[PDB]
């Protein structure tokens, strides 16, 4: 048994957005689940499958409302800022629990913009680090990679700060200096909301 | 409304260890208690449920136990996929409220941040923008402070720090720390320090550079 959801969401505060939960065998009833960036999990309310009858809990009452169809849905209505978050779809039976793999949903004025990618180099040791500056750009996310994936090892990029109504963040790369800049350092950012790639060469100064 | 306690919030163990984590309702549930796990923001997967019936798949150094409105989940013999966040779910009315949920983090050496900091870039400061990037990288526990400073004074505007999680491979802490400002602003000034303040130092790691050089 799987459950599977609808692909992110981006909507204006306001407006209203559908969001599907389908299972492949389809009893018992389900669940929805919110969870905000880095907070824990908040439970929005369960749908007895059998009766039709949905039961929400007090902040959700309102604007949210639970239908079905094999494809379970959350419809909320009068989206705030606020109501950024993921949400998850849950079912259960037997000795275990189904839950769907989540579905981001971002409520904003923004206006979608593509990434301002920028070389991060040295202003020398047989270990260097180098990185890629990712600025104002929205919504999220945006996948960054170094050598096309070839180097994944000694990498790490850094969670994204809200500044404005756009995202910056930045990646971290170490490489032996015997290998940069002899050999080609270049991160790849890719901003699926604007279908943007970018690609920068990690030139020394 | 019944509410659920959870404790502690944070929790550092190493691999081998065992563990407790609480939750407390504000109610009776008579045992309606689900426990879950969470790693990297991905789908929460059931431990147990009932309060003492491990879920289909879940090792057997997973336990719960209690009755009423206390109970707790015991994790002995700590795995290495056993790191991430728990929460504890009632549903015996509703609303089923989840726990404040517990993060679970690997407890390892301690290990002072390499820093490196960056100038803004020749493309950035061609479009008027100057951005300074320092990196804190690969140190263990996770507090850290930074601090800036311009021509021996600390600078507090125009900062914005990131914290990435404990790394899978080598449980240790990243930060990143970045100081905005205009080319005008930028080039008025000569040196610029990231100064970073951890346990493994009483002195401030720095790492700085200056235009004029």
């Known amino acids: 048994i799987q459950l599977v959801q609808s692909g992110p969401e981006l909507k204006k505060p306001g407006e209203t957005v559908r969001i599907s939960c389908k299972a492949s065998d389809y009893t018992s009833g389900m669940q929805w689940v919110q969870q905000m960036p880095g907070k824990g999990l908040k439970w929005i309310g369960w749908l007895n499958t059998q009766s039709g009858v949905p039961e929400y809990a007090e902040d959700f009452k309102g604007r949210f409302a639970f239908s079905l169809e094999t494809t379970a849905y959350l419809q909320i209505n009068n989206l705030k800022n606020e109501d950024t978050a993921t949400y998850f779809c849950?079912?259960?039976?037997?000795?275990?629990?189904?839950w769907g793999q989540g579905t981001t949903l971002t409520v904003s004025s923004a206006k979608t913009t593509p990434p301002s990618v920028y070389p991060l180099a040295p202003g020398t040791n047989s270990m260097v680090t180098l990185g890629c500056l990712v600025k104002g750009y929205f919504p999220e996310p945006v996948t960054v990679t170094w050598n096309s994936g070839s180097l994944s090892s000694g990498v790490h990029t850094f969670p994204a700060v809200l500044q404005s109504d756009l995202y910056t963040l930045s990646s971290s790369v170490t490489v032996p200096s015997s290998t940069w800049p002899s050999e080609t350092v270049t991160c790849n950012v890719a901003h699926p909301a604007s279908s943007t790639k970018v690609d920068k060469k990690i030139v020394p100064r | 409304d019944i509410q659920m306690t959870q404790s502690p919030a944070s929790l550092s163990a190493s691999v081998g260890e065992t563990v407790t984590i609480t939750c407390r309702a504000s109610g009776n549930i008579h045992n309606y208690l689900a426990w879950y796990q969470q790693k990297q923001g991905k789908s929460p997967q059931l431990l147990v449920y009932?309060?003492?019936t491990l879920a289909d798949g879940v090792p057997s150094r997973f336990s719960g136990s209690g009755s009423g409105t206390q109970y707790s989940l015991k994790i002995n013999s700590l795995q290495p996929e056993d790191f991430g966040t728990y929460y504890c779910?009632?549903?015996?009315?509703?609303?089923?409220?989840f726990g404040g949920g517990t993060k679970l983090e690997v407890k390892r050496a301690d290990a002072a941040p390499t820093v490196s900091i960056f100038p803004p870039s020749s493309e950035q400061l061609t479009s008027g923008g100057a951005s300074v990037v320092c990196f804190l990288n690969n140190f263990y526990p996770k507090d850290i402070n930074v601090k800036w400073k311009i021509d021996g004074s600390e600078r507090q505007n125009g900062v914005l720090n990131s914290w990435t999680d404990q790394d899978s491979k080598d449980s240790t802490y990243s930060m990143s720390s970045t100081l905005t400002l205009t080319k005008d602003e930028y080039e008025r000034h000569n040196s610029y320090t990231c100064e970073a303040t951890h346990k493994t130092s009483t002195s401030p790691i720095v790492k700085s550079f200056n235009r004029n050089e």
């Open positions: 779910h009632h549903f015996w009315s509703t609303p089923w409220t």
């Open positions: 849950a079912t259960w039976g037997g000795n275990s629990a189904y």
């Open positions: 009932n309060a003492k």
